[PDB]
Design a protein around this ligand. Sequence first.
Ligand SMILES: CNCc1ccc2c(c1)[C@@H](CC[C@H](O)CO)[C@H](CNC(=N)N)[C@H]2NC(=O)C(=O)Nc1ccc(Cl)c(F)c1
Ligand SMILES: CNCc1ccc2c(c1)[C@@H](CC[C@H](O)CO)[C@H](CNC(=N)N)[C@H]2NC(=O)C(=O)Nc1ccc(Cl)c(F)c1
Ligand SMILES: CNCc1ccc2c(c1)[C@@H](CC[C@H](O)CO)[C@H](CNC(=N)N)[C@H]2NC(=O)C(=O)Nc1ccc(Cl)c(F)c1
Ligand SMILES: CNCc1ccc2c(c1)[C@@H](CC[C@H](O)CO)[C@H](CNC(=N)N)[C@H]2NC(=O)C(=O)Nc1ccc(Cl)c(F)c1
Ligand SMILES: *[C@@H]1O[C@H](CO)[C@@H](O)[C@H](O)[C@H]1NC(C)=O
Ligand SMILES: *[C@@H]1O[C@H](CO)[C@@H](O)[C@H](O)[C@H]1NC(C)=O
Ligand SMILES: *[C@@H]1O[C@H](CO)[C@@H](O)[C@H](O)[C@H]1NC(C)=O
Ligand SMILES: *[C@@H]1O[C@H](CO)[C@@H](O)[C@H](O)[C@H]1NC(C)=O
Ligand SMILES: *[C@@H]1O[C@H](CO)[C@@H](O)[C@H](O)[C@H]1NC(C)=O
Ligand SMILES: *[C@@H]1O[C@H](CO)[C@@H](O)[C@H](O)[C@H]1NC(C)=O
Ligand SMILES: *[C@@H]1O[C@H](CO)[C@@H](O)[C@H](O)[C@H]1NC(C)=O
Ligand SMILES: *[C@@H]1O[C@H](CO)[C@@H](O)[C@H](O)[C@H]1NC(C)=O
Ligand SMILES: *[C@@H]1O[C@H](CO)[C@@H](O)[C@H](O)[C@H]1NC(C)=O
Ligand SMILES: *[C@@H]1O[C@H](CO)[C@@H](O)[C@H](O)[C@H]1NC(C)=O
Ligand SMILES: *[C@@H]1O[C@H](CO)[C@@H](O)[C@H](O)[C@H]1NC(C)=O
Ligand SMILES: *[C@@H]1O[C@H](CO)[C@@H](O)[C@H](O)[C@H]1NC(C)=O
Ligand SMILES: *[C@@H]1O[C@H](CO)[C@@H](O)[C@H](O)[C@H]1NC(C)=O
Ligand SMILES: *[C@@H]1O[C@H](CO)[C@@H](O)[C@H](O)[C@H]1NC(C)=O
Ligand SMILES: *[C@@H]1O[C@H](CO)[C@@H](O)[C@H](O)[C@H]1NC(C)=O
Ligand SMILES: *[C@@H]1O[C@H](CO)[C@@H](O)[C@H](O)[C@H]1NC(C)=O
Ligand SMILES: *[C@@H]1O[C@H](CO)[C@@H](O)[C@H](O)[C@H]1NC(C)=O
Ligand SMILES: *[C@@H]1O[C@H](CO)[C@@H](O)[C@H](O)[C@H]1NC(C)=O
Ligand SMILES: *[C@@H]1O[C@H](CO)[C@@H](O)[C@H](O)[C@H]1NC(C)=O
Ligand SMILES: *[C@@H]1O[C@H](CO)[C@@H](O)[C@H](O)[C@H]1NC(C)=O
Lengths: 335, 335, 335, 335
Amino acid sequence: KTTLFCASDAKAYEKEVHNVWATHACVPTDPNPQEMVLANVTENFNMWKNDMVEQMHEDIISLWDESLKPCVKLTGGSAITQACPKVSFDPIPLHYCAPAGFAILKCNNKTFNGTGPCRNVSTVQCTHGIKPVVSTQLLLNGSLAEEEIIIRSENLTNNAKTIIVHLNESVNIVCTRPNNIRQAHCNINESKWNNTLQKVGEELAKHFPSKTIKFEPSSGGDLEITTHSFNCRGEFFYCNTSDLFNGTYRNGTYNHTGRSSNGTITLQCKIKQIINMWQEVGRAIYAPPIEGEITCNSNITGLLLLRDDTETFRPGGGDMRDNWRSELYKYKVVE
Amino acid sequence: KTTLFCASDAKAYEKEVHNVWATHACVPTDPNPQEMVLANVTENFNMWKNDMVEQMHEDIISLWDESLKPCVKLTGGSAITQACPKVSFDPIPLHYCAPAGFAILKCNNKTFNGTGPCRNVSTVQCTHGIKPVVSTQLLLNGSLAEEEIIIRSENLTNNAKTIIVHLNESVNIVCTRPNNIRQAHCNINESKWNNTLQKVGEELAKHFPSKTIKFEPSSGGDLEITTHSFNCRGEFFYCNTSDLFNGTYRNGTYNHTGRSSNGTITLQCKIKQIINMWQEVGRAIYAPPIEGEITCNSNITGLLLLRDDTETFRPGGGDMRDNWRSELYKYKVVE
Amino acid sequence: KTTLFCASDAKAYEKEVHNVWATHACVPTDPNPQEMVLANVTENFNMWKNDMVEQMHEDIISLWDESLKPCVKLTGGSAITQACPKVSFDPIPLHYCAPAGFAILKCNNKTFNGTGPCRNVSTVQCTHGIKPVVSTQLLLNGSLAEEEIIIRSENLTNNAKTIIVHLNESVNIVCTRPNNIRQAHCNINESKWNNTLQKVGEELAKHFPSKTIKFEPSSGGDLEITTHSFNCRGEFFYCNTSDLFNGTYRNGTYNHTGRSSNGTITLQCKIKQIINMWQEVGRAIYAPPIEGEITCNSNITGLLLLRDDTETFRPGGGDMRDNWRSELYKYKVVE
Amino acid sequence: KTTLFCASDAKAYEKEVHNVWATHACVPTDPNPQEMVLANVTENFNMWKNDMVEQMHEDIISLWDESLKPCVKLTGGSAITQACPKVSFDPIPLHYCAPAGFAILKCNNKTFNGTGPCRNVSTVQCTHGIKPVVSTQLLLNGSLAEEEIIIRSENLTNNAKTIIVHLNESVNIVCTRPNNIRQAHCNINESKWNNTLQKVGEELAKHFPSKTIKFEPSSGGDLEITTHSFNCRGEFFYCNTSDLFNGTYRNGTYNHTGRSSNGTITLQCKIKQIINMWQEVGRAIYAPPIEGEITCNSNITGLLLLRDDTETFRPGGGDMRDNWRSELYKYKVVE
Ligand SMILES: CNCc1ccc2c(c1)[C@@H](CC[C@H](O)CO)[C@H](CNC(=N)N)[C@H]2NC(=O)C(=O)Nc1ccc(Cl)c(F)c1
Ligand SMILES: CNCc1ccc2c(c1)[C@@H](CC[C@H](O)CO)[C@H](CNC(=N)N)[C@H]2NC(=O)C(=O)Nc1ccc(Cl)c(F)c1
Ligand SMILES: CNCc1ccc2c(c1)[C@@H](CC[C@H](O)CO)[C@H](CNC(=N)N)[C@H]2NC(=O)C(=O)Nc1ccc(Cl)c(F)c1
Ligand SMILES: CNCc1ccc2c(c1)[C@@H](CC[C@H](O)CO)[C@H](CNC(=N)N)[C@H]2NC(=O)C(=O)Nc1ccc(Cl)c(F)c1
Ligand SMILES: *[C@@H]1O[C@H](CO)[C@@H](O)[C@H](O)[C@H]1NC(C)=O
Ligand SMILES: *[C@@H]1O[C@H](CO)[C@@H](O)[C@H](O)[C@H]1NC(C)=O
Ligand SMILES: *[C@@H]1O[C@H](CO)[C@@H](O)[C@H](O)[C@H]1NC(C)=O
Ligand SMILES: *[C@@H]1O[C@H](CO)[C@@H](O)[C@H](O)[C@H]1NC(C)=O
Ligand SMILES: *[C@@H]1O[C@H](CO)[C@@H](O)[C@H](O)[C@H]1NC(C)=O
Ligand SMILES: *[C@@H]1O[C@H](CO)[C@@H](O)[C@H](O)[C@H]1NC(C)=O
Ligand SMILES: *[C@@H]1O[C@H](CO)[C@@H](O)[C@H](O)[C@H]1NC(C)=O
Ligand SMILES: *[C@@H]1O[C@H](CO)[C@@H](O)[C@H](O)[C@H]1NC(C)=O
Ligand SMILES: *[C@@H]1O[C@H](CO)[C@@H](O)[C@H](O)[C@H]1NC(C)=O
Ligand SMILES: *[C@@H]1O[C@H](CO)[C@@H](O)[C@H](O)[C@H]1NC(C)=O
Ligand SMILES: *[C@@H]1O[C@H](CO)[C@@H](O)[C@H](O)[C@H]1NC(C)=O
Ligand SMILES: *[C@@H]1O[C@H](CO)[C@@H](O)[C@H](O)[C@H]1NC(C)=O
Ligand SMILES: *[C@@H]1O[C@H](CO)[C@@H](O)[C@H](O)[C@H]1NC(C)=O
Ligand SMILES: *[C@@H]1O[C@H](CO)[C@@H](O)[C@H](O)[C@H]1NC(C)=O
Ligand SMILES: *[C@@H]1O[C@H](CO)[C@@H](O)[C@H](O)[C@H]1NC(C)=O
Ligand SMILES: *[C@@H]1O[C@H](CO)[C@@H](O)[C@H](O)[C@H]1NC(C)=O
Ligand SMILES: *[C@@H]1O[C@H](CO)[C@@H](O)[C@H](O)[C@H]1NC(C)=O
Ligand SMILES: *[C@@H]1O[C@H](CO)[C@@H](O)[C@H](O)[C@H]1NC(C)=O
Ligand SMILES: *[C@@H]1O[C@H](CO)[C@@H](O)[C@H](O)[C@H]1NC(C)=O
Ligand SMILES: *[C@@H]1O[C@H](CO)[C@@H](O)[C@H](O)[C@H]1NC(C)=O
């Protein structure tokens, strides 16, 4: 254990809130990246017991509390008011770094599921650039897997633990509230979603080799988890995924049961002002949306699922630590 | 430097907030105190750089935070609203104690002014019972000097430094909002205040030997310090002292120039709901006062003064550290 | 996170080194403990991330450095020598206690594994009496589980994580060197060992589907961990467990295949002077053993195991922090 | 509050013990000296409450414990023996450095007494090169004030607080045991000492504006502080200063009353093997001196004085943190 520090390519002249946070919170990044390969050493990792995740989680909570200040923050019977201006919000990469006396070991196995022994490992000073993208159900703007799709989970047997599906080919998603000021929509290409959900069904079938693999929507919870919720240019998008997690993989082949038009799935979305926070147990009230075309052009790079004759997988999330684990699985800080 | 702990006679059954906080934060007072005298040993004390004061200060800050919750708390544009019930509020004595391996040296030189060598020292484990009374200008319900009045200051030649006047006999002040509901008043017996300012002028004259001494009201600043402000029964009293600090000591003889009637000085008071906090920079808003007759009967045991041919002294205070120093002056925690 | 203090009933007249250390380092035990029970609760515990264990670890390191002074201590090629008298050495219980305002919550579910939620928790200010017994492989003189033998592990699937087996009924082990001066031996009743190993195999079989469950001696490494090593009356015993951790649990029955005679397993032991320290990475050299009959009559109360068709368990140990966790599986410092 | 790191031009091939400690304890100094000057800015410093002093203190304690091992070390009833080889001993400069996310502000006021506000401040990453020279009474081989001679004290009215006299012109002292094997002597040119003490009396008279300034020898105590004690090439010199601190500054002129011969003051020295340690309380016993001619040619750069019709000043010291303060007064560590 230690206390890592962050490095970023943030610019002090920029008024984007990730930049403004990182300029006072993190140190300039290193153009001199030294990495030492060692093929004979083998080390053990547990991405689900990684304290880098806790440190980044606290850092990102700080980022949001200093950047996305709500008009009202309701917590523990208390109500906190403050100025809630519209801001320029677009996440930037953050590197996490070990101080003197410590190193970060990085697993070089491209098929590593994030748990157990990795026997090609290198030593580095900082992780790669990580954008702190808060979202659920879908992981956006992450890093793709270099080889095959990877299924990660602390206990695939345990239906309560979140499953992280690490994709190897990105799936583009475009969400837009165009120029009702709270109604929006996302567009996704049905063909790419079809083939990536087919190969995800294959990878999931290998861990469930008399079991049909079904994809169905979230059954219940707060709207933040029953929809694809995320933040776009400052506004809180809640996008219905009934037509996205909706299909069946049986006998090696995927059939999509959700609904398209001219080859595209469109999710209906609402820009909400009352938010159930992820940083703590409480609610946050923001100002109505800004004017004009609000669009985010993101890459789906991962999935957050929960498992329930056959096995059924629904979208999940909510604990943004899982978001940070999707990217910090390779890393472990050693002395 | 060590972490001290508190000890009190707080009762588990008492709804009064000091008792409630002490049942959870302090231990019961040792009914078998031990004190060992060292009459040949001489040790150096400095009441103005005493870590015991910082410790008691933080203890009382959290006492007030857990007990006297305001309806609104405003810190530079940010407003926290909570439940603000009326509570029962009567300060109880607190003893401060060193853990194992540490002791508390107590200077028993009844002449001691707070700084320098003390030659009659002793060793205890805990201080005497100290009521944490939050006040300006007047020190209430403290413990009196044994022989003559003591004048304490970090640096008498520095007019910015607060002077603490430690009285050897107490002046009774009775303060009441009787049964506009925010109007109250305070009665002081003018002959006792006469004699007290007489001999305080004597003792200050010794330190400024012509220089006719002059007592005058506070020059300016926030209402909390320009008045005798205190808390009685939970309500915040602000009482004008322009008739109380109003005199001239000249040619060894005292001269009170404030208005009086039937031998008693009466201070006009307001119960205010908007407060400038002492714990931190900010404002605190409380509920309208409770119904009925609100009375506190206190012993003025000390004065807080500021010095501006002739020397003029005006009531001061504000930094509650000085309130604690008025009682922690004769102690020092040694390993 | 806080600084706890120890309590003991050490007596100042005792020449025994645990007493000598505790009288100077701990406070007399308080004789009316109020276990404030509660019953709508669950709080999460993690015996494998517990600051209590580290503070106890540091205090025991200090005790051993002040009490069991080696003739030589070699640390990083640096050799410091000092007086190495033979001392009276018999561990005494130490209660650990939270200071003023902080509490120790305690889980009373007597099937509680050590990590996860707990449901019948009380509150005290001090733990029970814990004797700091330093040993490997077998835990001695601990507290027994009341109901059933419990298996504790940071992660039962990571073979590299130490497994603690909290036993139920103590197995008496008697270790002696009689009146070669460094040759000793220890007797264990083989029937009770067979019984206990059957129960341990039963519960490890419910934790591991149902492969045959073999017990084998320690792989390799320093003698301190390859043997049951402990300290008795100051002398360092290294006892061979090859005829002890040696059986096969198959068919729901346990078959012991270590050598016995007349119904007793006897381990062969050497008393050593050169010791690989547990407090630090270094070596200590002690004096030749004392004259006379050196024997300890101890209760095996727990086991320290390591896992590698079938699963094999071997005696582990080495990190005395796990010895502390076995009696602080816990409790918890709370405010 | 942070943990600094050192930086030295030490050589990994020099057997000199400061070099050998600094190659395994320090990083290389960098020709990266980016000084940042900020005149608008102005900050508060207190050279007497500066954690850099304590961090350098512990570092130098570590160096001495690893470099000048005594044959015998007596502390608290315990006696520790180790090899005590004669080593090559010559202190080298050490830079102290704030890690990433921290900076070191340095006050560029050349008249700064070390306490209060400084209007010209600059930020760098590391202090200037500071030789950790352990001595009493006279500060050796340090940095010189750039304009006037500076008087430093956390309280000049408290006679117990050490006074540091920062000289602007260095006074040469040559100490030698030539080729009784423990008899040595120091030569100091009497006229430069005459001028140095006259201007020191001038500054002290400014701060004591009557008060004939009188330099007298140290009253009493351990030999370490009643003499100018220091270490030269590994040997512990104790040199008598009764002919050094022995003069009177009256009506603006200084008269040296110390015994002089041929215009040079000669201090008699003993090389001692039993030393009262400065690191902790206890004694340390070293081997007899080496053979040959043992000489240090040093620059007196400051004084350590203590104040008793007049004011008397005697040489003092013995808390090597004051030695560190004489160089670490300019600096303060910031986030
Ligand atoms: C089986 N799953 C367990 C599960 C389920 C739901 C939730 C958690 C855990 C919490 C995580 C706690 C964290 O670990 C503490 O640090 C969190 C509690 N907080 C409440 N108010 N309920 C709650 N998640 C959120 O509400 C959340 O993600 N909202 C949100 C906002 C903005 C955006 Cl853009 C967004 F995409 C999402
Ligand atoms: C020359 N004098 C310096 C001086 C002057 C005024 C004041 C200080 C210092 C502060 C002390 C800071 C402390 O040291 C930090 O811990 C404090 C700042 N805080 C603000 N909001 N301005 C401010 N004092 C108060 O406002 C205060 O006493 N109010 C108060 C309330 C209730 C009761 Cl019953 C009462 F009797 C008093
Ligand atoms: C897979 N297991 C990991 C493993 C393995 C072996 C060992 C550790 C860890 C260390 C623990 C370090 C500690 O955590 C730091 O505080 C310790 C290192 N130290 C060295 N010299 N090698 C080393 N254990 C010991 O050597 C030890 O127990 N000896 C000992 C003496 C007297 C008695 Cl009576 C006794 F019963 C035992
Ligand atoms: C009014 N003055 C207070 C005063 C007075 C004398 C002394 C202190 C304080 C201690 C400082 C404690 C430190 O702060 C803890 O870290 C120290 C205690 N230690 C003992 N054994 N008495 C003791 N000083 C020394 O003995 C010392 O300097 N010897 C020494 C050796 C080698 C060399 Cl070359 C040298 F030039 C000097
Ligand atoms: C991940 O791989 C390890 C082996 O390296 C295995 O023990 C574990 O069960 C795997 N987990 C999943 C979810 O595949
Ligand atoms: C991604 O992984 C799948 C297997 O899950 C594989 O079939 C596909 O070819 C991969 N895509 C690549 C390597 O571009
Ligand atoms: C550690 O890895 C195991 C598998 O090796 C995994 O099941 C578990 O979720 C991980 N985290 C733990 C046990 O805290
Ligand atoms: C996962 O959970 C199952 C049952 O919930 C359990 O048998 C297994 O030991 C757990 N851990 C793993 C598979 O690492
Ligand atoms: C998603 O849409 C379907 C149909 O439009 C609806 O039945 C479902 O309740 C919606 N879910 C959410 C979370 O709005
Ligand atoms: C899949 O989508 C269709 C409409 O597109 C909907 O009727 C159906 O219920 C969905 N499947 C679910 C919710 O399991
Ligand atoms: C993903 O990245 C692109 C380009 O940086 C950006 O336009 C988009 O808004 C991002 N999506 C999210 C959710 O931040
Ligand atoms: C307090 O006593 C000390 C000790 O002599 C003295 O130096 C100081 O001036 C005194 N201060 C006051 C305010 O009396
Ligand atoms: C209080 O002190 C004054 C001197 O300041 C003295 O004249 C007076 O008699 C004292 N009163 C007592 C001791 O009651
Ligand atoms: C210094 O000591 C004097 C008397 O001992 C005291 O009045 C003063 O407050 C102390 N501190 C200073 C001058 O900063
Ligand atoms: C006290 O004040 C005087 C002038 O106001 C000043 O000379 C002195 O340095 C101050 N501090 C002390 C005496 O500690
Ligand atoms: C106190 O009252 C007088 C007259 O009654 C007034 O001049 C003065 O301003 C008042 N001071 C405060 C602080 O209210
Ligand atoms: C003293 O009190 C009178 C009222 O009785 C007032 O007029 C006078 O201004 C006061 N003295 C001051 C404020 O200095
Ligand atoms: C002082 O003490 C009396 C009696 O204990 C009490 O009535 C009064 O309210 C106290 N004053 C303050 C300011 O607490
Ligand atoms: C140092 O200068 C400050 C003014 O910045 C002054 O307050 C302090 O008394 C001075 N101290 C000494 C020892 O000269
Ligand atoms: C050193 O300072 C003294 C006064 O303290 C001054 O008279 C002398 O000229 C200075 N020497 C220099 C600046 O070289
Ligand atoms: C200083 O020393 C010289 C001899 O080197 C002597 O002649 C001179 O008078 C002395 N001056 C003073 C002021 O003591
Ligand atoms: C220094 O020398 C003088 C006379 O030479 C002597 O009286 C004094 O005691 C010596 N000081 C010490 C500390 O030995
Ligand atoms: C100064 O030196 C002379 C001769 O060395 C000595 O007699 C005198 O006592 C000294 N002054 C002191 C010790 O104050
Ligand atoms: C002072 O520096 C010189 C030159 O490096 C050196 O010879 C001498 O030993 C140093 N003095 C001390 C006391 O270390």
